[PDB]
UniProtKB/Swiss-Prot annotation:
Tissues with expression: Expressed in gastric carcinoma tissue and the expression gradually increases with the progression of the carcinoma (at protein level).
Catalytic activities: L-seryl-[protein] + ATP = O-phospho-L-seryl-[protein] + ADP + H(+); L-threonyl-[protein] + ATP = O-phospho-L-threonyl-[protein] + ADP + H(+)
Region (Interaction with beta subunit): 34-39
Associated disorder: Okur-Chung neurodevelopmental syndrome: An autosomal dominant neurodevelopmental disorder characterized by developmental delay, intellectual disability, behavioral problems, hypotonia, speech problems, microcephaly, pachygyria and variable dysmorphic features.
Molecular function terms, GO-annotated: ATP binding; Hsp90 protein binding; identical protein binding; kinase activity; protein serine kinase activity; protein serine/threonine kinase activity
Parent-record interval covered: 3 to 329 of 391
Domain Protein kinase residues, every copy: 37-322
Chain positions recorded as ATP binding sites: L43, G44, R45, G46, K47, Y48, S49, E50, V51, K66
EC number(s) from the headed UniProt entry: 2.7.11.1
Function as written in the Swiss-Prot or TrEMBL entry: Catalytic subunit of a constitutively active serine/threonine-protein kinase complex that phosphorylates a large number of substrates containing acidic residues C-terminal to the phosphorylated serine or threonine. Regulates numerous cellular processes, such as cell cycle progression, apoptosis and transcription, as well as viral infection. May act as a regulatory node which integrates and coordinates numerous signals leading to an appropriate cellular response.
Protein name according to UniProt: Casein kinase II subunit alpha
Subcellular location: Nucleus
Length: 327
């Protein structure tokens, strides 16, 4: 069967924790006062919750309220525990409170407010420098989470809140995030299609933090090449084919061969044979100002089939691409 895999970093952080740190099932929620908060506007509704702009009349500050749908009964304590574990970390969204919504009769998570600009309108204007700046900020969040034994598993532009005016960034929606336990098998039905790592698409369950570095790379590619999304699959199968048309099929087979993975036989008729492409073919007059040798090398080291070969978040922060960013 499949060969096992372990993260190359932060492998044993949770094993050296009291059970309570990662045992989210046993967590006892501290409930706040629902009447502290007044809902102002509905912002949106995801699969697992409805999201509101609200006000915290106890102090009068603006907050964000995520009223959890009757979800997968236990995603709740997982998200709460992860949020509490990561609170105060660099660019980690701050859980301000947890209350019981009187109408939904479900938990309502209360967050810090962030003044975001739609990523679409936002990415059409970001300069080269600003791409680097904000990527570095995202990496701080990811490395922090990983050092705390947690992977986000849903990195995508919609989950990065950016207050461009204040050049402030927050990584949000930790509802899919998990504790990393070496040797543990995970659900491959995580992340959004265009940001799913090859490991998910070939149904390899023993993945780790490095999943999010693929997603970050897919984000970066869309930004520096001005192509949304960069890997544009019709479904999860076509998604892998779109990746293979860039990274090539030989390295794909090397990957699944290394882990003794067998592709779904439905790929036989659709995968074809594809050479690895040089990144220069995606450069054109409209995106050239966003591209540099450093950008391409950085991208190249994120977008690897083999999850074990990708840059870790810390290694990524060491890359020459970020030398120009003021620290």
């Amino acid at each position: 069967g499949p060969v096992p895999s372990r993260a190359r970093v932060y492998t044993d952080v949770n094993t050296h924790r009291p059970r309570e740190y990662w045992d989210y099932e046993s967590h006892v929620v501290e409930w706040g006062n629902q009447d502290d908060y007044q809902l102002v506007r509905k912002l949106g509704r995801g699969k697992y919750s409805e999201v509101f702009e609200a006000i915290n009349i106890t102090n009068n500050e603006k907050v964000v309220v995520k009223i959890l749908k009757p979800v997968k009964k236990k995603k709740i304590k997982r998200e709460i525990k992860i949020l509490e574990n990561l609170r105060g970390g660099p660019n980690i969204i701050t859980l301000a409170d947890i209350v019981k919504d009187p109408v939904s009769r479900t938990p309502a998570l209360v967050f810090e407010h962030v003044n975001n600009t739609d990523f679409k309108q936002l990415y059409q204007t970001l300069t080269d420098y600003d791409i680097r700046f904000y990527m570095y900020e995202i990496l701080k969040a990811l490395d922090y989470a990983n050092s705390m034994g947690i992977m986000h598993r849903d990195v995508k532009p919609h989950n990065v809140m950016i207050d461009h005016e204040h050049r402030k960034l927050r990584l949000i929606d930790w509802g899919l995030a998990e504790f990393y336990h070496p040797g543990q098998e995970y659900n491959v039905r995580v992340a959004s299609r265009y940001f799913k790592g090859p490991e998910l698409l070939v149904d390899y369950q023993m993945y780790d933090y490095s999943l999010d570095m693929w997603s970050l790379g897919a984000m970066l590619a869309s930004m520096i090449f001005r192509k949304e999304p960069f890997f544009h699959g019709h479904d999860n199968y076509d998604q892998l084919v779109r990746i293979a048309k860039v990274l090539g099929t030989e390295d794909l087979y090397d990957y699944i061969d290394k882990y003794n993975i067998e592709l779904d036989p439905r790929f036989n008729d659709i995968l074809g044979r594809h050479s690895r492409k040089r990144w220069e073919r995606f450069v054109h007059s409209e995106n050239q100002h966003l591209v540099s040798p450093e950008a391409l090398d950085f991208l190249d080291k994120l977008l690897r089939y083999d999850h074990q070969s990708r840059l870790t978040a810390r290694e990524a922060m060491e890359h020459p691409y970020f030398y120009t960013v003021v620290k």
